[PDB]
Amino acid sequence: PFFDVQKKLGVDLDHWMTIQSAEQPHRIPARCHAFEKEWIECAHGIGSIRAEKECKIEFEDFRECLLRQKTMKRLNAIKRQRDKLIKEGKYTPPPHHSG
Amino acid sequence: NVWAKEPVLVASFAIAGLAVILPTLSPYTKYSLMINRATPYNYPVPLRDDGNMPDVPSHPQDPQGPSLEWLKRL
Amino acid sequence: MMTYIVFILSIIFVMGFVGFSSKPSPIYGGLGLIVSGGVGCGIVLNFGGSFLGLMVFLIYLGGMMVVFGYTTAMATEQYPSNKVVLGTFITGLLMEFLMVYYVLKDKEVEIVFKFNGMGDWVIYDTGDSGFFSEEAMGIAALYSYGTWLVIVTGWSLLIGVVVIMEITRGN
Amino acid sequence: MSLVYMNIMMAFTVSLTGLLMYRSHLMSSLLCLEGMMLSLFILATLMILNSHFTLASMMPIILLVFAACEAALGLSLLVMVSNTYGTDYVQNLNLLQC
Amino acid sequence: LLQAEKDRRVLQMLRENLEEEATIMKDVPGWKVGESVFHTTRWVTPMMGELYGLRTGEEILSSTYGFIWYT
Amino acid sequence: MFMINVLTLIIPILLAVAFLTLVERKVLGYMQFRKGPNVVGPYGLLQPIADAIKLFIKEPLRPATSSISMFILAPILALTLALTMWIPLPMPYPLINMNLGVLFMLAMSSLAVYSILWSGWASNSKYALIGALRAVAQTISYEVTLAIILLSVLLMNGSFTLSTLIITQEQVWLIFPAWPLAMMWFISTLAETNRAPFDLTAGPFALFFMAEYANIIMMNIFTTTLFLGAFHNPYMPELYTINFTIKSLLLSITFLWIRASYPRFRYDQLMHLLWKNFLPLTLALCMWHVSLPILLSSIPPQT
Amino acid sequence: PGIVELPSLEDLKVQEVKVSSSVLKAAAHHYGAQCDKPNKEFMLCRWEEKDPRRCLEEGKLVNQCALEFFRQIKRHCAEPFTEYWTCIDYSGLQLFRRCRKEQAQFDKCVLDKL
Amino acid sequence: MNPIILIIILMTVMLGTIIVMISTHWLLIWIGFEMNMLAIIPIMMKKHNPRATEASTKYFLTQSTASMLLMMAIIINLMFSGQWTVMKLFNPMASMLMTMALAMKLGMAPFHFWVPEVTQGIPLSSGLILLTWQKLAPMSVLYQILPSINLDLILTLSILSITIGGWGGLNQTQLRKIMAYSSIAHMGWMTAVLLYNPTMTLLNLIIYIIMTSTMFTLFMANSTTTTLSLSHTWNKAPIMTILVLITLLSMGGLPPLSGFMPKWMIIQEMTKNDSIILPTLMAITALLNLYFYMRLTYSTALTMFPSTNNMKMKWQFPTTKRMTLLPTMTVLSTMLLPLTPILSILE
Amino acid sequence: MNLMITLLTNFTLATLLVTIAFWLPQPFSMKFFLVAITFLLFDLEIALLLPLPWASQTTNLNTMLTMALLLIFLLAVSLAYEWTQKGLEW
Amino acid sequence: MWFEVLPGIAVMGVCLFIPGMATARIHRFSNGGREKRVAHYSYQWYLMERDRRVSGVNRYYVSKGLENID
């Protein structure tokens, strides 16, 4: 079983190693701070089932902040398209440093 | 006594015990904590101006805010 | 000498893991794990890596493989290569060659994932005001916030000491 | 997806198969356990660095020191087995049959 | 002051790089020109491939990997 | 220009080591009642040139090896440590300014332990293996002590950059706030260089010899940076380089001078002495150098 | 889904203060004294909205304030301000305890004259 | 062995298991499992025979690779959506690796090859403490992370562990192997109902721990390895025989006796779903693993094997073993039948 | 890669020295094992100690002093235990 | 006497005197009298990057003071 002496004694000795956005020793954020704050406020007073079926949009926003999967997919598609059209030869590219 | 028996151990216990005790009788620990607190890492973030509060000074020259003066004077 | 140096050092890393997972004599195994630890240090220092990758180097390449080679020297003999060892090394090189060939000349290689295949200059910091090398102040916690963690870690090492002496004839 | 993570997970599978299939010496098995340890270390460290997960950046070094003292216990057990026998093979252990 | 110059420079790379993308991708179907992949209406910090993308090697190696092995 | 910097570091190491051989032979000769080597030219600098090129000329040890590649792989590691360990050492401007260098020092000392162990396994039959095994034990027993003491002496300065060390040495020498800790550190440097009064009783003998003496000059330079020295006014580095060279030379002469006149220790006396006398005393100095900067209102400006 | 709303190239033209780093570092404190009063507008904009592409008018304001400040220090005393920052330039990372007497000289110039 | 050192090692076993119970961080759970291993290694090799040495070697290898595969599952969890909260996981692959790690931690059918070998060459006290705390420590974790597990994992391991602890078990007269195969069958039972109502799993954990404590206390009362030694215990004392009768029948689970109560409630809150063929298969195998209990009872207290003299000598000495707590655990373990609505004492 | 350039130059010049030096002229004890494991465990405790000079600038100083003294105190208890209990004797 | 050993130690000390002095000379030569800028933090590297960006020569040593204000 899981017990709750952590809450019972009033010593929150283990809740600070836990998430981001708990106060760092110098007040700096992580890379996805605000996404976490809105996601935690979305799924706080929630029985973890309408958390699964209701906060899905902001959770996917947070996941794609954390890993940046499909944004890299879009950038990689741009890179492959740029490579094949410079292989073609149309507009010897002025996207680098000059016209 | 044991000063002839195992002397480096007794010296280690003595310097150990004074290292335990000596921060209790210390007129400099509050100085240490003020030095350690008064060094900022992040940006000192401003705030929305006033509810006409006699704090949070507008010019950084204004000494109404809490500053450091025991730094320059050792 | 170019951009994908993290990827290339990762290639040498997985080659080193194959090079002692082929089961040689364990002093060759210690050599393979030392080479693998050095290039893993290279990878994490390429991510920077300012403290932790130089920190592992004293422990594994400073304190662990020493005792592994020590115990290789004092316990087992292995006094005289083989078909099975070098054959597994060949098949491991073949599997790495196949995976990296399909990373190179295609889009992505999927075990069950979508590994977006290009070298990682992404992602990285956009030149922030770090000023303290965030690893450094992070590990410069554990003594203000770290009440429980270092206590149970040191307690586990103390119990490790009494365990080792008991099994090696306590008291 | 930060492509290098695929290679380090494949390296984890390399070290895990090297831990599981092992022919003669227990020392190679223990050293591949150490390699698996290094793989988890590096993978989690690159994740925490690119996340700027700066508060709880303790995971690499503390995972390291714990599984290092695990490897120390394994060294002592291998020394005890090699002390009560001649060698430290996987064979000469077929006593105590299941 | 450094913060203001940094913000103007990263928005400069954003504007010029989306202009480059709008010039370069008019062949593929779909493709809205400047969609964040994310959903919330917030300025996310870019990922050093949105800033230093398609700059061909030299500046991105001297920018990302500069401090990492500069002495 | 950077490869020119590297070659101007690692070209004078051969000069330094060979002239250290003549200097140790002459200084032992005058601690004794001997002149010479001085028949081989004036005072014998061509004498280290001559015996170095002689040992290159002389026919190598025939194998008699086990894994030829491993047998060559150990001394190549020893000499590349001896080369790659003068990179962050500041005489006034070091080659690479690092965030941390002292942990790199201790890590490369442990790689020297690897060199000893690999040469010991790949060498020969069982008796030399037992001898090199005891050598690895008596080498590894001191990296506890030296790392502990180096940590407690940098704790007065808080940072690892070591240019902060050359700043913080400006007022007093660091021998005055820590003399016993520095003394025990110097004994640990005698342990790491593996010389008399500590016992060790191969191929290539010249390469193992080279690694030995470059390790000695390394520890002497790191000592001279670490515990003493003087200021450095910029736009004149010759002044600090002169004072640094003179103090490091006096300390290396003192090092060989301490070697010159003491018998070798018993091995169990060596382990007994190290554990039961240096290890509680190092712990005592560590706990006092922890609890003292929180006393005297002086915790360093670790930027 | 939603597309970003980037600012134009018409707002991305401020007279940029293309000055070097050591002179900007040595000219920091009195720039904190006279100017840097209306840029906490910019700081509060940046910390009440986490969204540059919006607070850029105040970025143009701090840009013109810093350029006006360096104009004002350019026209009057000191010209040995140039001597002061080139005294502090070649000293590695710029410690401010390096060239202290000329710091006193520049302070006495700007105090007795401005 | 020093008694101070044994009190310290018991303190560290309790510390590691309480850290597994109480923490909310993943590193702390891994530390608790590792410290449980490190402390439980010198309880084994309490003597210095090579049997305990090889047993501890096998146990250390399997336990350490289970610990590191658990750490692999956690680092996969932070490769995906990353926070150190013991909650729903965020990968079927990570949950798969994690439940297979815990299946190595506590006695499961693909992974049970170390359990009879680790129990055979050790004394009784080490076997008792390893069964109790090494079958208590992962159950808290599985009770935590149940809402993100593919069910076929848990159900396949449960079915196959019940039938392996059944079929393997008809062949050994080594009593430690008998109790180990019984442990495999009951851990299959106690894992089976994890995704339906875990109150049944924890109540079955309580009942199984008390039953195994009674059984091993009865074996520690008179040192036996085989059934013939139990027939000599029949000759020397009669009350141990009726205790072996009652405790073996309560391991068998008969409805007048308290060992039936964990089976019956499992069948109830399993068949309130659409699972019927799976309960009747599990309860047929529960009929199967009673047979070696029954031939053990036939060997001990009901038929009688021929005895050897010097039992005549042992008559002149009354019994002088200390029991830790035998009779309280016995009547708590066997007469607990009309206290079924002490089900809801748990959640 | 700059220190990798230095490492490459040192490694290549060392291999040149070795290969031009070579082309031209033509049981055990438990007491051996206890010291190595004692090294290993005290070295891991050194690894726990050594981020102490990183940490000494925070707003929680008394607690840092207490747990740092606890770490060296535990290390001293381990040392004195194997000292008194014939761990290093001959 | 030890007058006959001081040439050996003298020449070997000169062999140890040379590389740091020549290295510092190459440091001062490779930036035009400047010292090479040390880099340990992201803050110093970003300041160095904007310094070498504003210089026009893409070189961080020119140091462009006060003569591009207005």
PDB file of N, CA, C and O in Angstrom, chain F residues 1 5 8-10 12-13 15-16 19-20 22-23 26-27 30 42-43 91 93 97-99 237 241 245, chain J residues 1-2 4-5 7-9 11-24 26-27 30 38-40:
ATOM      1  N   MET F   1      47.961  28.249 -35.335  1.00  0.00           N
ATOM      2  CA  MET F   1      48.740  28.758 -34.217  1.00  0.00           C
ATOM      3  C   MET F   1      48.520  27.889 -32.988  1.00  0.00           C
ATOM      4  O   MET F   1      49.356  27.832 -32.084  1.00  0.00           O
ATOM      5  N   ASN F   5      51.051  26.128 -30.444  1.00  0.00           N
ATOM      6  CA  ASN F   5      50.990  26.165 -28.981  1.00  0.00           C
ATOM      7  C   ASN F   5      51.195  24.782 -28.378  1.00  0.00           C
ATOM      8  O   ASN F   5      51.936  24.620 -27.396  1.00  0.00           O
ATOM      9  N   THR F   8      54.813  23.812 -28.839  1.00  0.00           N
ATOM     10  CA  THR F   8      55.669  24.513 -27.892  1.00  0.00           C
ATOM     11  C   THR F   8      55.425  24.091 -26.454  1.00  0.00           C
ATOM     12  O   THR F   8      56.213  24.457 -25.577  1.00  0.00           O
ATOM     13  N   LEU F   9      54.353  23.352 -26.185  1.00  0.00           N
ATOM     14  CA  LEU F   9      54.282  22.708 -24.881  1.00  0.00           C
ATOM     15  C   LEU F   9      54.997  21.357 -24.854  1.00  0.00           C
ATOM     16  O   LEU F   9      55.722  21.063 -23.897  1.00  0.00           O
ATOM     17  N   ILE F  10      54.827  20.526 -25.887  1.00  0.00           N
ATOM     18  CA  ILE F  10      55.263  19.131 -25.807  1.00  0.00           C
ATOM     19  C   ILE F  10      56.571  18.864 -26.537  1.00  0.00           C
ATOM     20  O   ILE F  10      56.975  17.701 -26.654  1.00  0.00           O
ATOM     21  N   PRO F  12      59.457  20.928 -25.382  1.00  0.00           N
ATOM     22  CA  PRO F  12      60.427  20.984 -24.275  1.00  0.00           C
ATOM     23  C   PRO F  12      60.250  19.928 -23.193  1.00  0.00           C
ATOM     24  O   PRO F  12      61.002  19.969 -22.212  1.00  0.00           O
ATOM     25  N   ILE F  13      59.311  18.987 -23.309  1.00  0.00           N
ATOM     26  CA  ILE F  13      59.187  17.980 -22.258  1.00  0.00           C
ATOM     27  C   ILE F  13      60.328  16.981 -22.331  1.00  0.00           C
ATOM     28  O   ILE F  13      60.797  16.497 -21.298  1.00  0.00           O
ATOM     29  N   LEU F  15      63.405  17.716 -23.437  1.00  0.00           N
ATOM     30  CA  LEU F  15      64.503  18.503 -22.879  1.00  0.00           C
ATOM     31  C   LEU F  15      64.438  18.523 -21.361  1.00  0.00           C
ATOM     32  O   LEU F  15      65.447  18.273 -20.689  1.00  0.00           O
ATOM     33  N   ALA F  16      63.242  18.763 -20.816  1.00  0.00           N
ATOM     34  CA  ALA F  16      63.047  18.837 -19.372  1.00  0.00           C
ATOM     35  C   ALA F  16      63.326  17.506 -18.695  1.00  0.00           C
ATOM     36  O   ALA F  16      63.995  17.468 -17.658  1.00  0.00           O
ATOM     37  N   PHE F  19      67.183  16.542 -19.041  1.00  0.00           N
ATOM     38  CA  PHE F  19      67.997  17.379 -18.184  1.00  0.00           C
ATOM     39  C   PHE F  19      67.654  17.158 -16.719  1.00  0.00           C
ATOM     40  O   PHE F  19      68.518  17.343 -15.864  1.00  0.00           O
ATOM     41  N   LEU F  20      66.444  16.676 -16.422  1.00  0.00           N
ATOM     42  CA  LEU F  20      66.131  16.232 -15.072  1.00  0.00           C
ATOM     43  C   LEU F  20      66.894  14.965 -14.705  1.00  0.00           C
ATOM     44  O   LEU F  20      67.253  14.788 -13.539  1.00  0.00           O
ATOM     45  N   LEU F  22      69.986  14.253 -15.811  1.00  0.00           N
ATOM     46  CA  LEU F  22      71.340  14.689 -15.456  1.00  0.00           C
ATOM     47  C   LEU F  22      71.338  15.437 -14.131  1.00  0.00           C
ATOM     48  O   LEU F  22      72.284  15.312 -13.352  1.00  0.00           O
ATOM     49  N   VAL F  23      70.282  16.206 -13.854  1.00  0.00           N
ATOM     50  CA  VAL F  23      70.223  16.969 -12.612  1.00  0.00           C
ATOM     51  C   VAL F  23      70.064  16.047 -11.416  1.00  0.00           C
ATOM     52  O   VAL F  23      70.725  16.239 -10.395  1.00  0.00           O
ATOM     53  N   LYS F  26      73.532  14.362 -10.936  1.00  0.00           N
ATOM     54  CA  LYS F  26      74.499  15.294 -10.358  1.00  0.00           C
ATOM     55  C   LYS F  26      74.161  15.632  -8.911  1.00  0.00           C
ATOM     56  O   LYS F  26      75.056  15.721  -8.067  1.00  0.00           O
ATOM     57  N   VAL F  27      72.878  15.821  -8.605  1.00  0.00           N
ATOM     58  CA  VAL F  27      72.501  16.215  -7.253  1.00  0.00           C
ATOM     59  C   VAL F  27      72.682  15.051  -6.290  1.00  0.00           C
ATOM     60  O   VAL F  27      73.176  15.244  -5.181  1.00  0.00           O
ATOM     61  N   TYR F  30      76.355  14.972  -5.579  1.00  0.00           N
ATOM     62  CA  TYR F  30      76.861  15.942  -4.617  1.00  0.00           C
ATOM     63  C   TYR F  30      76.211  15.843  -3.242  1.00  0.00           C
ATOM     64  O   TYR F  30      76.742  16.423  -2.290  1.00  0.00           O
ATOM     65  N   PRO F  42      81.137  19.253 -21.522  1.00  0.00           N
ATOM     66  CA  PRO F  42      81.064  20.116 -20.339  1.00  0.00           C
ATOM     67  C   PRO F  42      79.810  19.840 -19.534  1.00  0.00           C
ATOM     68  O   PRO F  42      78.690  20.157 -19.947  1.00  0.00           O
ATOM     69  N   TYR F  43      80.005  19.164 -18.403  1.00  0.00           N
ATOM     70  CA  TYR F  43      79.025  18.890 -17.355  1.00  0.00           C
ATOM     71  C   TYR F  43      77.899  17.959 -17.797  1.00  0.00           C
ATOM     72  O   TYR F  43      76.990  17.701 -17.003  1.00  0.00           O
ATOM     73  N   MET F  91      50.799  28.351 -15.982  1.00  0.00           N
ATOM     74  CA  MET F  91      51.710  29.457 -15.789  1.00  0.00           C
ATOM     75  C   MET F  91      51.227  30.583 -16.692  1.00  0.00           C
ATOM     76  O   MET F  91      50.759  30.307 -17.804  1.00  0.00           O
ATOM     77  N   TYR F  93      49.215  32.268 -18.359  1.00  0.00           N
ATOM     78  CA  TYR F  93      48.091  31.923 -19.213  1.00  0.00           C
ATOM     79  C   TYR F  93      48.171  30.446 -19.551  1.00  0.00           C
ATOM     80  O   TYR F  93      49.119  30.025 -20.231  1.00  0.00           O
ATOM     81  N   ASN F  97      41.713  27.265 -20.577  1.00  0.00           N
ATOM     82  CA  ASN F  97      40.953  27.678 -19.404  1.00  0.00           C
ATOM     83  C   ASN F  97      39.716  26.803 -19.307  1.00  0.00           C
ATOM     84  O   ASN F  97      38.915  26.743 -20.244  1.00  0.00           O
ATOM     85  N   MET F  98      39.556  26.123 -18.180  1.00  0.00           N
ATOM     86  CA  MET F  98      38.467  25.185 -17.988  1.00  0.00           C
ATOM     87  C   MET F  98      37.543  25.657 -16.878  1.00  0.00           C
ATOM     88  O   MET F  98      37.887  26.529 -16.080  1.00  0.00           O
ATOM     89  N   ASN F  99      36.354  25.060 -16.841  1.00  0.00           N
ATOM     90  CA  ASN F  99      35.502  25.228 -15.675  1.00  0.00           C
ATOM     91  C   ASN F  99      36.073  24.476 -14.483  1.00  0.00           C
ATOM     92  O   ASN F  99      35.948  24.930 -13.340  1.00  0.00           O
ATOM     93  N   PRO F 237      54.339  38.789 -18.440  1.00  0.00           N
ATOM     94  CA  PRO F 237      54.259  37.433 -17.885  1.00  0.00           C
ATOM     95  C   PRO F 237      55.607  36.823 -17.554  1.00  0.00           C
ATOM     96  O   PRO F 237      55.645  35.780 -16.876  1.00  0.00           O
ATOM     97  N   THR F 241      56.542  34.018 -14.638  1.00  0.00           N
ATOM     98  CA  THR F 241      57.102  32.770 -15.145  1.00  0.00           C
ATOM     99  C   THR F 241      58.478  32.499 -14.542  1.00  0.00           C
ATOM    100  O   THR F 241      58.796  31.350 -14.212  1.00  0.00           O
ATOM    101  N   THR F 245      59.141  29.325 -12.161  1.00  0.00           N
ATOM    102  CA  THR F 245      60.181  28.369 -12.510  1.00  0.00           C
ATOM    103  C   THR F 245      61.178  28.197 -11.375  1.00  0.00           C
ATOM    104  O   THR F 245      61.570  27.067 -11.064  1.00  0.00           O
TER     105      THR F 245
ATOM    106  N   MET J   1      82.591  20.909  -6.933  1.00  0.00           N
ATOM    107  CA  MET J   1      81.397  21.035  -6.110  1.00  0.00           C
ATOM    108  C   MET J   1      80.128  21.049  -6.958  1.00  0.00           C
ATOM    109  O   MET J   1      80.152  20.671  -8.126  1.00  0.00           O
ATOM    110  N   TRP J   2      79.019  21.504  -6.366  1.00  0.00           N
ATOM    111  CA  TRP J   2      77.732  21.652  -7.042  1.00  0.00           C
ATOM    112  C   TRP J   2      77.695  22.820  -8.016  1.00  0.00           C
ATOM    113  O   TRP J   2      76.634  23.095  -8.587  1.00  0.00           O
ATOM    114  N   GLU J   4      79.257  22.268 -10.611  1.00  0.00           N
ATOM    115  CA  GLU J   4      79.267  21.401 -11.779  1.00  0.00           C
ATOM    116  C   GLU J   4      77.938  20.689 -12.018  1.00  0.00           C
ATOM    117  O   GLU J   4      77.832  19.925 -12.981  1.00  0.00           O
ATOM    118  N   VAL J   5      76.926  20.919 -11.183  1.00  0.00           N
ATOM    119  CA  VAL J   5      75.600  20.373 -11.428  1.00  0.00           C
ATOM    120  C   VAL J   5      74.600  21.456 -11.825  1.00  0.00           C
ATOM    121  O   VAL J   5      73.622  21.159 -12.518  1.00  0.00           O
ATOM    122  N   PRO J   7      74.890  23.725 -14.235  1.00  0.00           N
ATOM    123  CA  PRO J   7      74.584  23.754 -15.678  1.00  0.00           C
ATOM    124  C   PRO J   7      73.502  22.782 -16.110  1.00  0.00           C
ATOM    125  O   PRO J   7      72.656  23.157 -16.929  1.00  0.00           O
ATOM    126  N   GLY J   8      73.486  21.563 -15.568  1.00  0.00           N
ATOM    127  CA  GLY J   8      72.455  20.609 -15.954  1.00  0.00           C
ATOM    128  C   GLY J   8      71.065  21.048 -15.532  1.00  0.00           C
ATOM    129  O   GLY J   8      70.131  21.073 -16.346  1.00  0.00           O
ATOM    130  N   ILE J   9      70.922  21.444 -14.263  1.00  0.00           N
ATOM    131  CA  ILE J   9      69.643  21.919 -13.750  1.00  0.00           C
ATOM    132  C   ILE J   9      69.263  23.238 -14.407  1.00  0.00           C
ATOM    133  O   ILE J   9      68.080  23.496 -14.653  1.00  0.00           O
ATOM    134  N   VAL J  11      70.014  24.230 -17.612  1.00  0.00           N
ATOM    135  CA  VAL J  11      69.523  23.981 -18.964  1.00  0.00           C
ATOM    136  C   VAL J  11      68.177  23.266 -18.924  1.00  0.00           C
ATOM    137  O   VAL J  11      67.278  23.572 -19.721  1.00  0.00           O
ATOM    138  N   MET J  12      67.974  22.371 -17.951  1.00  0.00           N
ATOM    139  CA  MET J  12      66.674  21.711 -17.863  1.00  0.00           C
ATOM    140  C   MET J  12      65.581  22.666 -17.383  1.00  0.00           C
ATOM    141  O   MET J  12      64.431  22.570 -17.834  1.00  0.00           O
ATOM    142  N   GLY J  13      65.927  23.630 -16.526  1.00  0.00           N
ATOM    143  CA  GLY J  13      64.958  24.639 -16.135  1.00  0.00           C
ATOM    144  C   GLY J  13      64.626  25.595 -17.262  1.00  0.00           C
ATOM    145  O   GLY J  13      63.487  26.059 -17.370  1.00  0.00           O
ATOM    146  N   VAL J  14      65.608  25.909 -18.110  1.00  0.00           N
ATOM    147  CA  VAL J  14      65.328  26.693 -19.309  1.00  0.00           C
ATOM    148  C   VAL J  14      64.423  25.910 -20.255  1.00  0.00           C
ATOM    149  O   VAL J  14      63.511  26.472 -20.876  1.00  0.00           O
ATOM    150  N   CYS J  15      64.619  24.590 -20.330  1.00  0.00           N
ATOM    151  CA  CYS J  15      63.706  23.747 -21.095  1.00  0.00           C
ATOM    152  C   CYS J  15      62.312  23.713 -20.485  1.00  0.00           C
ATOM    153  O   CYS J  15      61.332  23.488 -21.206  1.00  0.00           O
ATOM    154  N   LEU J  16      62.192  23.926 -19.174  1.00  0.00           N
ATOM    155  CA  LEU J  16      60.873  24.092 -18.566  1.00  0.00           C
ATOM    156  C   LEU J  16      60.381  25.531 -18.577  1.00  0.00           C
ATOM    157  O   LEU J  16      59.176  25.759 -18.422  1.00  0.00           O
ATOM    158  N   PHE J  17      61.277  26.501 -18.739  1.00  0.00           N
ATOM    159  CA  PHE J  17      60.868  27.898 -18.774  1.00  0.00           C
ATOM    160  C   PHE J  17      60.186  28.253 -20.086  1.00  0.00           C
ATOM    161  O   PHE J  17      59.293  29.109 -20.112  1.00  0.00           O
ATOM    162  N   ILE J  18      60.583  27.595 -21.175  1.00  0.00           N
ATOM    163  CA  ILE J  18      60.180  28.054 -22.510  1.00  0.00           C
ATOM    164  C   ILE J  18      58.696  27.915 -22.854  1.00  0.00           C
ATOM    165  O   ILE J  18      58.144  28.883 -23.411  1.00  0.00           O
ATOM    166  N   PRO J  19      57.972  26.798 -22.577  1.00  0.00           N
ATOM    167  CA  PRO J  19      56.713  26.602 -23.318  1.00  0.00           C
ATOM    168  C   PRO J  19      55.577  27.511 -22.872  1.00  0.00           C
ATOM    169  O   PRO J  19      54.808  27.960 -23.726  1.00  0.00           O
ATOM    170  N   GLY J  20      55.485  27.845 -21.586  1.00  0.00           N
ATOM    171  CA  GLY J  20      54.438  28.750 -21.152  1.00  0.00           C
ATOM    172  C   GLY J  20      54.673  30.173 -21.612  1.00  0.00           C
ATOM    173  O   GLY J  20      53.726  30.880 -21.966  1.00  0.00           O
ATOM    174  N   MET J  21      55.934  30.602 -21.641  1.00  0.00           N
ATOM    175  CA  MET J  21      56.253  31.947 -22.105  1.00  0.00           C
ATOM    176  C   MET J  21      55.989  32.083 -23.598  1.00  0.00           C
ATOM    177  O   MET J  21      55.382  33.068 -24.041  1.00  0.00           O
ATOM    178  N   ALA J  22      56.405  31.087 -24.387  1.00  0.00           N
ATOM    179  CA  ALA J  22      56.119  31.120 -25.815  1.00  0.00           C
ATOM    180  C   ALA J  22      54.626  30.975 -26.096  1.00  0.00           C
ATOM    181  O   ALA J  22      54.111  31.599 -27.030  1.00  0.00           O
ATOM    182  N   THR J  23      53.914  30.203 -25.271  1.00  0.00           N
ATOM    183  CA  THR J  23      52.470  30.071 -25.423  1.00  0.00           C
ATOM    184  C   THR J  23      51.763  31.386 -25.147  1.00  0.00           C
ATOM    185  O   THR J  23      50.882  31.785 -25.910  1.00  0.00           O
ATOM    186  N   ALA J  24      52.155  32.088 -24.075  1.00  0.00           N
ATOM    187  CA  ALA J  24      51.570  33.391 -23.772  1.00  0.00           C
ATOM    188  C   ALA J  24      51.906  34.422 -24.841  1.00  0.00           C
ATOM    189  O   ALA J  24      51.085  35.304 -25.133  1.00  0.00           O
ATOM    190  N   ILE J  26      52.181  33.602 -28.012  1.00  0.00           N
ATOM    191  CA  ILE J  26      51.277  33.276 -29.116  1.00  0.00           C
ATOM    192  C   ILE J  26      49.836  33.682 -28.786  1.00  0.00           C
ATOM    193  O   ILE J  26      49.077  34.081 -29.680  1.00  0.00           O
ATOM    194  N   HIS J  27      49.457  33.633 -27.504  1.00  0.00           N
ATOM    195  CA  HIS J  27      48.162  34.166 -27.077  1.00  0.00           C
ATOM    196  C   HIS J  27      48.060  35.656 -27.362  1.00  0.00           C
ATOM    197  O   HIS J  27      47.060  36.125 -27.922  1.00  0.00           O
ATOM    198  N   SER J  30      47.964  36.207 -31.294  1.00  0.00           N
ATOM    199  CA  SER J  30      46.820  35.753 -32.073  1.00  0.00           C
ATOM    200  C   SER J  30      45.564  36.574 -31.824  1.00  0.00           C
ATOM    201  O   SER J  30      44.502  36.215 -32.339  1.00  0.00           O
ATOM    202  N   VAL J  38      38.656  33.893 -22.077  1.00  0.00           N
ATOM    203  CA  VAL J  38      38.266  32.629 -21.475  1.00  0.00           C
ATOM    204  C   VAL J  38      36.749  32.495 -21.508  1.00  0.00           C
ATOM    205  O   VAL J  38      36.010  33.490 -21.552  1.00  0.00           O
ATOM    206  N   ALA J  39      36.274  31.254 -21.495  1.00  0.00           N
ATOM    207  CA  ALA J  39      34.860  30.962 -21.705  1.00  0.00           C
ATOM    208  C   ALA J  39      34.477  29.762 -20.857  1.00  0.00           C
ATOM    209  O   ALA J  39      34.856  28.630 -21.168  1.00  0.00           O
ATOM    210  N   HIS J  40      33.707  30.007 -19.802  1.00  0.00           N
ATOM    211  CA  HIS J  40      33.240  28.957 -18.914  1.00  0.00           C
ATOM    212  C   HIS J  40      31.736  28.906 -18.770  1.00  0.00           C
ATOM    213  O   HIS J  40      31.209  27.866 -18.366  1.00  0.00           O
TER     214      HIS J  40
END
